[PDB]
Enzyme design. Sequence first.
Site, short mmCIF file in Angstrom:
data_model
loop_
_atom_site.label_atom_id
_atom_site.label_comp_id
_atom_site.label_asym_id
_atom_site.label_seq_id
_atom_site.Cartn_x
_atom_site.Cartn_y
_atom_site.Cartn_z
N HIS A 43 1.41 1.23 -3.74
CA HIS A 43 0.53 0.35 -2.97
C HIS A 43 -0.72 0.02 -3.77
O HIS A 43 -1.02 0.62 -4.81
CB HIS A 43 0.21 0.96 -1.58
CG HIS A 43 -0.86 2.01 -1.58
ND1 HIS A 43 -1.85 2.08 -0.63
CD2 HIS A 43 -1.07 3.06 -2.42
CE1 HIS A 43 -2.63 3.12 -0.87
NE2 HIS A 43 -2.18 3.73 -1.96
N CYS A 97 -7.53 3.43 -4.10
CA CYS A 97 -6.86 4.70 -3.88
C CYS A 97 -6.77 5.47 -5.19
O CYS A 97 -6.68 4.87 -6.27
CB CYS A 97 -5.47 4.47 -3.29
SG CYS A 97 -4.48 5.92 -2.94
N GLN A 115 0.10 6.88 7.47
CA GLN A 115 -0.43 6.16 8.62
C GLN A 115 0.62 5.20 9.16
O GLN A 115 1.39 4.62 8.40
CB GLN A 115 -1.71 5.42 8.25
CG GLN A 115 -2.69 6.28 7.51
CD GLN A 115 -4.12 5.96 7.87
OE1 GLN A 115 -4.98 5.85 6.99
NE2 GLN A 115 -4.38 5.77 9.16
N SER A 138 -7.39 3.17 6.53
CA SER A 138 -7.93 3.26 5.17
C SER A 138 -8.46 1.93 4.67
O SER A 138 -9.36 1.92 3.82
CB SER A 138 -6.87 3.78 4.19
OG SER A 138 -6.12 4.84 4.73
N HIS A 141 -3.65 -2.93 2.63
CA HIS A 141 -2.71 -2.54 1.58
C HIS A 141 -1.77 -3.68 1.22
O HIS A 141 -1.40 -4.49 2.06
CB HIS A 141 -1.83 -1.37 2.00
CG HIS A 141 -2.56 -0.23 2.63
ND1 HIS A 141 -2.71 0.99 2.00
CD2 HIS A 141 -3.14 -0.10 3.84
CE1 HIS A 141 -3.37 1.82 2.79
NE2 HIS A 141 -3.64 1.18 3.92
#
Length: 147
Positions: A43, A97, A115, A138, A141
């Site tokens: 990702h 990330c 998630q 977060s 993505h």
Amino acid sequence: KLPPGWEKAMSRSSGRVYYFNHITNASQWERPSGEPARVRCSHLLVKHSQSRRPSSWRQEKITRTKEEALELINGYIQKIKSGEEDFESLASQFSDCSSAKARGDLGAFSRGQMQKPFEDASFALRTGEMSGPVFTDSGIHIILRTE
Ligand SMILES: Cc1nc(C)c(CO)s1
């Protein structure tokens, strides 16, 4: 009719039909082709100021708005789809990330570990397919299913 989560749509600019997936937010002109215990994904995450932890190895304080993060994601998707840039190259350079260091690779995972909107999009992608913008706590993505 169509694979899980796909539906027909009409282009507003061209009038030609296209196909959209409401689980992965992918969209494409061609009719989609044709579940496992585990999948493997990479990702590219773009965080924003409402992210669960608004910080990353790129920025101590991430201040960008949700709107701005979506525009960045949209731009990265355009360069990936045109072939101007590779997913792996954009993830190493711009993903918020820690997995950026691994060209975005997260390894393999089962349901119940990630998630939930990330999980559902990952398992709805076919091997090799890439998502549209997927939203979680977060951030936003782009997901590439590699296995
Ligand atoms: C969250 C992650 N960080 C790294 C460096 C990974 C390796 O795949 S996954």
